[PDB]
Amino acid sequence: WTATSGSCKGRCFELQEVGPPDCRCDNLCKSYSSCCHDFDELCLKTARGWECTKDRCGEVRNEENACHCSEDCLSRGDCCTNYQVVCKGESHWVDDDCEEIKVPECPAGFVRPPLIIFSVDGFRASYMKKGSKVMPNIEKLRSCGTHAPYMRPVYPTKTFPNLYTLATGLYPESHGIVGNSMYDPVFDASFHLRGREKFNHRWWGGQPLWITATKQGVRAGTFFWSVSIPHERRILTILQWLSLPDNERPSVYAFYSEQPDFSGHKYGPFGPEMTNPLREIDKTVGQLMDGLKQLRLHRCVNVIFVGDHGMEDVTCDRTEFLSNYLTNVDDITLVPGTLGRIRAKSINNSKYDPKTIIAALTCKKPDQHFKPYMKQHLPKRLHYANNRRIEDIHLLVDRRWHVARKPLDVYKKCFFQGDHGFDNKVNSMQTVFVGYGPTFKYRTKVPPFENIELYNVMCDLLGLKPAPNNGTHGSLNHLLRTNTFRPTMPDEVSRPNYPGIMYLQSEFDLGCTCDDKVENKLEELNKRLHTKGSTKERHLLYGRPAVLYRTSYDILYHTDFESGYSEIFLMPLWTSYTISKQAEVSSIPEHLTNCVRPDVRVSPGFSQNCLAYKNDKQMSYGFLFPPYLSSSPEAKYDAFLVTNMVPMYPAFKRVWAYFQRVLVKKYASERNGVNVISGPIFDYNYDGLRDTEDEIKQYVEGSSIPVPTHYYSIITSCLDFTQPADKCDGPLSVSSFILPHRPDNDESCNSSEDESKWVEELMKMHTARVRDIEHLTGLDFYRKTSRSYSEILTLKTYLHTYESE
Ligand SMILES: *[C@@H]1O[C@H](CO)[C@@H](O[C@@H]2O[C@H](CO)[C@@H](O[C@@H]3O[C@H](CO[C@H]4O[C@H](CO)[C@@H](O)[C@H](O[C@H]5O[C@H](CO)[C@@H](O)[C@H](O)[C@@H]5O[C@H]5O[C@H](CO)[C@@H](O)[C@H](O)[C@@H]5O)[C@@H]4O)[C@@H](O)[C@H](O[C@H]4O[C@H](CO)[C@@H](O)[C@H](O)[C@@H]4O[C@H]4O[C@H](CO)[C@@H](O)[C@H](O)[C@@H]4O)[C@@H]3O)[C@H](O)[C@H]2NC(C)=O)[C@H](O)[C@H]1NC(C)=O
Ligand SMILES: CNC(=O)c1ccc(-c2cn(Cc3ccccc3)c3ncccc23)c([N+](=O)[O-])c1
Ligand SMILES: [Ca+2]
Ligand SMILES: [Ca+2]
Ligand code: NA
Ligand code: NA
Ligand SMILES: [Zn+2]
């Protein structure tokens, strides 16, 4: 119930929200059907439109008008945005040359530069170039301020997940808005774009920027606008709030535009109909900047122009139907479209089996345009699993396609020509970032970055301490003129042991064998020095990784590689080696095929054993440092030490062997040497964070050897590829992966072919940031470089996407 007989007089777009049944006059009252009886009359005036004209200049104030051109309007804070231009001979903001804003130039009584976030739904990154002729205000923002060529959204590349990520710095799995549509089985409630459930605060986790501000004494405008409030009114409301007394004025504001998304769905991302929506959004930006100029705020406010996701060509005919795959299609509920989420239709149906649904959806049609995954097997870069609102079965849909349950769903619902929601590395899903104002840099281009990083920056722009989030604070310092955040490296929690030779060969009873009893004073001191760390500067180029949790581990040195060996997990946490451009690949010799050698630095009790592998009919083993890249026949023996062995399914070994034998050398050739750090990951509860020992669900049969869920590699070289990886003077370049450790290659539909036809395609799908690997291992990389720490944070957030231009 709402007692809509209260009044909005003096309350239009009030900031504090009033509680039922009292009627509301705030910017969301329409969405709740709760506005007072006179809200349209008082708050949504439209008389005479949005622009001053010559005949209105100096008019007698008429309170009915949408905006004013009377002499008093500047002090009332409610002139039309073009008032000074039409009536006082001023120029539009867009027609002024840009001039660097070296310091905030703010009116007296401003405690800080305000922040205005201008969010545009569906604004695909390539519109900045492709539409630049029809968007002069935006182009001036972009060319004069700080811009990225694009900004990566979060998955799924839908509106509600992305806007809430922008506001919180959190992945959707952590903030809880995991799609535009959701079912929460604990609440037993559904969240939908239409209707009232979405207003319940229980769906919305983390802490959004407007709450972070309020808690710390910075006032915020309300970020949401009911759809029927016209854009011109949203802008004039922001400008009016900016004219409030100091004690009442917010410091942070957001504008939201449903365009160009709304038209992009109907017409496709580059439909000829799209030009007009782009023109209109530009004109709104112009109104805001003209309005700031009239208030003498145009060199005071930081403006962020930012999109939630892009837009792809998608039509009804490019729909896959689960009814063409599944016998039991009436026993499932599908959340359809540009991603699929499957659960049981009835929790009382005990004949429902995820395994049989996955198998019926796997590589069934030659050009199949979706791929099924149990959610824990999704690429780790998506961070899309740790929430009970995310169904166990997920369908990744190819760009340009939809998935639906049955044909009748699609024609009893061709209308549309555009959609979004696909994998967030897809080029058409990328969106925009421009920052303009005193705290941003002048005419500066920055590399692409992820929208999870902006919350920290928006907190920095406002002097707020960010709530805990998934950005890496400091990684966007290069966007800013001032207000940089200067983090310190985390402290190492565990220091390594450096064991020497402590065990005789006969103390080991590991069931291993090796043909190495093949028998010099020059060469003996030499091998001793390698075991003491004499080649370590070649193979550990950026310092040893720091271990950020309590554990017991050993540093082990060798001619060709260095490792940090966990006495708890019985394998390395990391193995580091450098391969120069000139390195040669060799084979594993015949006499060494099944060679595993005890490591006399590490006790039998802290070692793996061969007999467990022999007995585990499912499980084989591989090596972290690859024997193929040994520097000499004699150094190759080091590669067969039991301390370099890790458990691997035979199907996985196909992938790993090709990576090690072919791809490492290929990258060394292309990049002028590479430094590689490889290791295991254990994430059995799919939370993106390192498992403790007591979370491990699977061991090599009969043993305490834990089975990794994933294997990572971090591959680092010099950004200036004219310098070798091991003698780099300047910035680094990196690519990384987190490969799922699976007992089959069902993910790769072409896996019966030669590895040259499918392995690298698998690795590109599982591309990762160094930061992803850090969360998953509790290690901290790049501790000893010549580079600034902020620069290294940016490197750790880089994702190599393999998307074309
Ligand atoms: C991305 O950044 C985020 C933010 O930093 C990272 O997320 C944090 O990770 C922490 C570890 O997973 C986690 O810390 C836990 O907090 C528990 C208290 O949680 C509440 O309070 C906080 C603070 O206000 C709040 O933010 C939480 O909000 C979550 O929960 C509600 C749902 O009820 C949601 O609305 C909200 O969206 C959010 O959900 C997300 O997180 C939860 C987990 O908290 C998930 O389950 C959801 O799926 C979703 O992803 C909460 O309201 C605290 O109780 C935990 O402590 C337990 O575990 C420790 C281990 O150290 C143990 O010592 C304790 O005894 C305790 O164990 C007991 O409970 C167990 C489970 O019932 C039981 O088995 C034991 O036997 C014990 O009884 C823990 O400290 C922190 O909450 C989240 N924060 C957020 C916002 O998500 C995230 O890791 C980053 N991602 C990456 C990849 O880096
Ligand atoms: C048909 N869909 C709509 O009309 C529509 C869809 C989404 C939103 C919306 C606005 N913010 C606030 C905001 C603004 C800028 C940056 C971050 C956050 C969100 N934060 C989370 C989820 C949805 C929204 C609104 N809106 O303005 O209320 C309308
Ligand atoms: Ca959107
Ligand atoms: Ca984990
Ligand atoms: Na075996
Ligand atoms: Na396969
Ligand atoms: Zn949309």
Side-chain angles (χ1 to χ4, degrees), residues 1-412 414-518 520-805:
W1 185 273
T2 301
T4 72
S5 75
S7 173
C8 289
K9 168 194 157 63
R11 293 170 63 201
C12 272
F13 297 99
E14 64 187 358
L15 291 166
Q16 285 166 36
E17 198 205 304
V18 297
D22 305 354
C23 64
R24 286 170 54 180
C25 305
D26 64 280
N27 64 9
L28 275 184
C29 75
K30 285 288 180 180
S31 295
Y32 290 74
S33 293
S34 61
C35 306
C36 307
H37 73 272
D38 53 8
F39 177 83
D40 291 311
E41 181 189 354
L42 298 178
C43 308
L44 301 178
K45 294 167 162 148
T46 55
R48 303 205 68 182
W50 309 112
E51 286 162 30
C52 287
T53 52
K54 285 140 178 189
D55 57 288
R56 291 192 63 185
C57 299
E59 75 191 354
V60 182
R61 170 163 289 265
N62 184 337
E63 302 280 12
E64 286 179 358
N65 287 330
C67 54
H68 304 281
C69 312
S70 52
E71 200 63 16
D72 65 345
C73 74
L74 290 160
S75 41
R76 289 286 300 278
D78 62 9
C79 316
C80 305
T81 64
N82 72 338
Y83 171 72
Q84 293 201 151
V85 175
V86 174
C87 303
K88 296 292 204 287
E90 265 292 1
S91 47
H92 289 287
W93 171 84
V94 64
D95 295 311
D96 300 330
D97 288 351
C98 80
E99 301 287 317
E100 187 176 7
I101 308 163
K102 288 189 186 160
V103 298
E105 301 175 8
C106 289
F110 275 74
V111 67
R112 62 180 70 78
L115 175 61
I116 298 169
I117 297 152
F118 190 107
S119 66
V120 280
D121 191 351
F123 199 107
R124 171 177 175 162
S126 56
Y127 288 163
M128 292 303 286
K129 186 159 294 148
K130 297 171 74 58
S132 63
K133 283 349 158 61
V134 304
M135 303 186 308
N137 286 273
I138 290 160
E139 171 61 19
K140 181 185 175 181
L141 286 177
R142 182 202 73 71
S143 58
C144 291
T146 296
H147 78 288
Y150 60 89
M151 179 183 73
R152 186 178 309 119
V154 284
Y155 183 78
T157 50
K158 297 294 200 171
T159 301
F160 275 54
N162 276 278
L163 290 180
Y164 204 54
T165 287
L166 285 174
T168 59
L170 295 166
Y171 301 117
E173 69 177 4
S174 288
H175 59 60
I177 309 303
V178 308
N180 283 345
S181 176
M182 321 181 261
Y183 175 66
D184 186 301
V186 171
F187 301 158
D188 178 45
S190 298
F191 177 108
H192 300 299
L193 293 153
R194 304 293 188 159
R196 318 193 61 79
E197 186 50 45
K198 66 162 192 298
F199 302 117
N200 193 322
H201 280 196
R202 68 190 177 170
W203 294 94
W204 301 86
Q207 187 187 90
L209 183 63
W210 57 88
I211 303 305
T212 306
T214 296
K215 291 187 183 281
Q216 298 174 46
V218 175
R219 208 148 323 101
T222 51
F223 282 34
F224 299 88
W225 296 88
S226 293
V227 64
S228 68
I229 301 167
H231 288 190
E232 294 90 344
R233 179 54 62 198
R234 301 185 192 186
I235 296 297
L236 285 163
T237 302
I238 293 169
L239 293 169
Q240 188 75 70
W241 286 332
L242 281 161
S243 292
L244 292 163
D246 299 336
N247 78 317
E248 295 182 49
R249 189 176 55 243
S251 296
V252 62
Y253 299 86
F255 168 95
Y256 171 75
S257 164
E258 304 80 4
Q259 289 283 31
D261 178 270
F262 181 75
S263 285
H265 280 289
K266 288 157 84 319
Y267 304 120
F270 308 107
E273 301 84 349
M274 291 303 300
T275 286
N276 284 344
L278 294 183
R279 290 197 186 272
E280 285 310 291
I281 295 158
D282 197 73
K283 178 176 189 150
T284 305
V285 174
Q287 288 180 348
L288 173 66
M289 299 311 295
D290 284 352
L292 294 174
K293 185 184 174 178
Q294 295 200 138
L295 302 178
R296 303 182 290 110
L297 283 167
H298 66 305
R299 305 173 46 86
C300 171
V301 169
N302 292 300
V303 175
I304 287 168
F305 181 84
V306 67
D308 55 355
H309 51 72
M311 189 64 71
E312 175 61 275
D313 298 284
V314 188
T315 52
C316 312
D317 68 313
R318 286 197 295 268
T319 301
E320 297 261 9
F321 298 102
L322 293 191
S323 59
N324 295 325
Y325 294 81
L326 291 186
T327 58
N328 54 290
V329 80
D330 296 316
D331 289 342
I332 64 165
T333 295
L334 172 73
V335 193
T338 54
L339 46 149
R341 315 202 303 272
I342 293 167
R343 57 180 193 276
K345 182 149 179 129
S346 155
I347 40 136
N348 301 138
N349 169 16
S350 58
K351 228 133 270 126
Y352 179 84
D353 186 12
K355 291 153 175 302
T356 81
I357 287 147
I358 290 286
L361 294 176
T362 295
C363 308
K364 282 302 147 79
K365 308 258 148 68
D367 269 314
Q368 191 170 309
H369 303 276
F370 65 89
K371 183 187 289 317
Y373 290 81
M374 287 308 291
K375 62 180 180 171
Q376 65 274 19
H377 292 154
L378 286 170
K380 298 300 272 180
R381 65 185 167 76
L382 300 175
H383 296 281
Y384 197 71
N386 185 212
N387 194 288
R388 69 199 185 206
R389 301 162 192 174
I390 295 166
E391 284 79 1
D392 292 343
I393 298 160
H394 198 77
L395 308 185
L396 283 187
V397 180
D398 286 358
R399 64 185 86 187
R400 304 171 44 92
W401 283 79
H402 274 174
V403 61
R405 202 172 58 97
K406 286 191 249 203
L408 69 80
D409 293 346
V410 164
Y411 62 79
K412 305 278 274 204
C414 195
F415 343 87
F416 61 88
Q417 294 179 261
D419 208 350
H420 51 90
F422 304 107
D423 186 334
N424 64 332
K425 86 168 166 59
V426 170
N427 264 357
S428 59
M429 291 305 91
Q430 306 311 296
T431 186
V432 297
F433 174 83
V434 174
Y436 175 96
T439 312
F440 288 108
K441 293 182 166 188
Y442 175 66
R443 299 186 177 281
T444 293
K445 182 177 57 218
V446 307
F449 61 89
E450 306 189 335
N451 71 349
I452 58 167
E453 302 297 333
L454 279 179
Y455 171 80
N456 283 333
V457 171
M458 294 187 295
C459 289
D460 291 339
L461 291 165
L462 296 161
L464 301 173
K465 171 175 186 175
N469 69 89
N470 307 124
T472 288
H473 198 178
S475 76
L476 293 190
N477 277 355
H478 62 291
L479 275 64
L480 311 170
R481 180 184 297 272
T482 65
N483 296 22
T484 49
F485 176 78
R486 288 298 173 187
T488 66
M489 272 181 189
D491 293 328
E492 185 149 29
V493 169
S494 299
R495 70 175 154 272
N497 304 293
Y498 296 89
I501 299 181
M502 286 159 69
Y503 301 96
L504 300 169
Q505 174 81 14
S506 73
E507 303 187 62
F508 294 88
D509 191 19
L510 303 175
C512 301
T513 60
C514 188
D515 190 342
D516 68 348
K517 339 283 157 202
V518 204
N520 194 358
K521 258 185 215 154
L522 320 148
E523 290 199 57
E524 257 157 76
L525 191 29
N526 208 23
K527 25 164 262 201
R528 269 169 264 169
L529 300 179
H530 291 339
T531 297
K532 315 257 188 143
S534 85
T535 66
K536 81 190 163 211
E537 343 293 332
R538 176 61 171 349
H539 297 300
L540 202 61
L541 286 184
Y542 324 103
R544 79 170 158 67
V547 173
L548 305 188
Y549 59 100
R550 187 62 253 174
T551 199
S552 183
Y553 80 109
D554 300 309
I555 299 303
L556 306 175
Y557 296 118
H558 321 75
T559 308
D560 294 338
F561 65 101
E562 179 175 339
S563 68
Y565 178 86
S566 175
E567 300 195 325
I568 303 308
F569 286 71
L570 308 174
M571 67 187 70
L573 295 180
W574 56 262
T575 296
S576 181
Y577 61 101
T578 299
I579 303 304
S580 82
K581 191 180 176 164
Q582 297 67 51
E584 213 162 303
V585 175
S586 54
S587 63
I588 294 175
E590 273 180 57
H591 72 287
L592 296 181
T593 307
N594 297 303
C595 168
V596 176
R597 300 172 56 244
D599 191 331
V600 296
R601 301 166 292 195
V602 175
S603 82
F606 294 136
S607 299
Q608 290 175 50
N609 74 90
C610 294
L611 188 62
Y613 288 102
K614 186 184 187 297
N615 296 340
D616 193 322
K617 294 309 191 295
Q618 312 309 313
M619 186 62 69
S620 180
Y621 65 88
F623 290 109
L624 289 173
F625 171 77
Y628 320 109
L629 302 173
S630 64
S631 58
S632 76
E634 164 147 311
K636 202 195 282 295
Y637 288 88
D638 294 348
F640 299 102
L641 284 169
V642 68
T643 46
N644 183 38
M645 178 174 54
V646 291
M648 289 186 179
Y649 293 116
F652 193 73
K653 289 173 70 199
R654 300 182 61 201
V655 170
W656 188 248
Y658 185 76
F659 162 64
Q660 292 192 318
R661 184 180 57 84
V662 181
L663 299 177
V664 171
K665 182 59 208 154
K666 185 181 86 187
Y667 307 150
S669 294
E670 292 171 349
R671 302 173 46 178
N672 195 1
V674 296
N675 175 259
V676 178
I677 302 174
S678 297
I681 280 163
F682 304 87
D683 190 22
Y684 278 96
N685 61 358
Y686 50 86
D687 66 358
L689 308 173
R690 175 196 54 99
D691 289 349
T692 52
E693 318 183 41
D694 65 356
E695 292 175 326
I696 299 310
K697 293 172 70 47
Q698 180 186 350
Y699 287 89
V700 178
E701 197 173 310
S703 73
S704 293
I705 308 172
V707 174
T709 55
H710 298 81
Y711 282 101
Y712 68 90
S713 289
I714 298 167
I715 305 175
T716 304
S717 63
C718 201
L719 187 65
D720 174 11
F721 54 95
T722 77
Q723 302 185 311
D726 68 357
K727 306 196 196 63
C728 182
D729 290 332
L732 299 172
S733 172
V734 70
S735 57
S736 302
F737 62 71
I738 298 168
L739 279 165
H741 181 212
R742 288 172 63 176
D744 55 70
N745 286 303
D746 293 358
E747 195 178 348
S748 304
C749 289
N750 289 327
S751 62
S752 64
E753 296 158 44
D754 180 73
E755 285 86 1
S756 65
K757 299 304 182 232
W758 63 272
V759 168
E760 213 175 357
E761 184 196 331
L762 181 67
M763 296 169 56
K764 295 173 182 182
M765 190 49 32
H766 291 280
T767 188
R769 310 173 307 144
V770 169
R771 201 76 182 97
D772 297 322
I773 295 161
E774 293 190 331
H775 300 318
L776 284 163
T777 59
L779 300 172
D780 189 66
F781 300 100
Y782 304 126
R783 319 256 305 165
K784 306 287 183 165
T785 74
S786 58
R787 319 298 311 171
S788 108
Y789 187 40
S790 276
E791 181 190 303
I792 290 305
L793 294 175
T794 306
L795 186 67
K796 290 177 162 184
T797 65
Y798 177 80
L799 180 72
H800 196 74
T801 56
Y802 305 94
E803 286 289 294
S804 63
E805 296 215 320

